[PDB]
Design a protein around this ligand. Structure first.
Ligand SMILES: NC(=O)NCCC[C@H](N)C(=O)O
Length: 255
């Protein structure tokens, strides 16, 4: 398989006020702009076309387009963010999704809450984390939609991270990056688990795109663990997004 498209959104000046549970300082808007540009330039080398949406000042975290939608090979499901300040992000991305998925857009409804960063796609199976942002009802609604379309899904329990993909990344070919509490999960033991060292935990969030793997710059052990598997590794500094608990998976929709 291969992805044909990516969707992303320019960061807003209000990014400095993005939600966070970290204490790594506040994002520097000018520097964040340069990093997002570097991220797009990396994506321009991955044989995909890119749809880059304009910034929206009303939504500080709207650069993290991964959360408001789940794009699959069969349909797109608009989610329902658990974070109060981000629920409205579904509205500003709906027109784009509708253009790519005519007559194939589904949606999560109350009382469900889902943020797609909690979803990890492995073939036609979708692992969905039960977090502070994605509740069991939301997971249920999503699994039912996936099943309606011939896909499958399951719930993964978590307690220590913001979203499932904060500490996990599937790089195709059975290669799974795992950090913290996901490393010893029974559901993931038939994968080739690549345990991320503690000092480099942030680097568990990486993206496979057409045999290239885009990862945060500054995590050398992880970079070598991926490189040796045969992937073309591209390093992009995302330090300003790390400050507001986001990374490379967070910043795009890939399908
Ligand atoms: N899928 C993701 O990695 N989402 C990260 C969202 C970070 C944002 N500052 C938030 O707290 O919602």
């Amino acid at each position: 398989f291969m992805f044909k498209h990516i969707i992303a959104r320019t960061p807003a000046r209000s990014l400095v006020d993005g939600l966070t549970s970290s204490h790594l300082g506040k994002p520097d808007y000018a520097k964040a702009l340069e990093q997002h540009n570097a991220y797009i330039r990396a994506l321009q080398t991955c044989d995909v076309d890119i749809t880059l949406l304009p910034p929206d000042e009303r939504f500080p975290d709207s650069v993290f387009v991964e959360d408001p939608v789940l794009c699959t090979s069969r349909c797109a499901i608009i989610t329902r963010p658990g974070a109060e300040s981000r629920r409205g992000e579904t509205e500003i991305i709906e027109e784009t999704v509708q253009r790519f998925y005519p007559g194939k857009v589904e949606r999560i409804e109350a009382p469900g809450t889902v943020e797609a960063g909690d979803i990890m796609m492995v073939g036609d199976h979708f692992y969905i984390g039960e977090s502070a942002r994605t509740n069991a009802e939301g997971a249920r609604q999503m699994i039912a939609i996936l099943e309606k379309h011939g896909l499958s899904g399951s719930v993964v329990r978590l307690e220590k991270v913001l979203h499932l993909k904060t500490g996990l990344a599937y790089l195709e070919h059975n290669n799974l990056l795992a950090a913290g509490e996901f490393v010893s999960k029974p559901e993931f033991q038939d994968f080739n688990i690549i345990e991320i060292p503690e000092e480099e935990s942030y680097a568990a969030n990486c993206i496979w795109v057409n045999e290239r793997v885009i990862m945060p710059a500054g995590y050398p052990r992880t970079r070598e663990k991926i490189a040796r598997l045969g992937y073309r590794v591209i390093e992009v500094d995302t330090s300003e997004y790390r400050k507001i608990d986001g990374g490379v998976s967070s910043m795009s929709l890939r399908f």
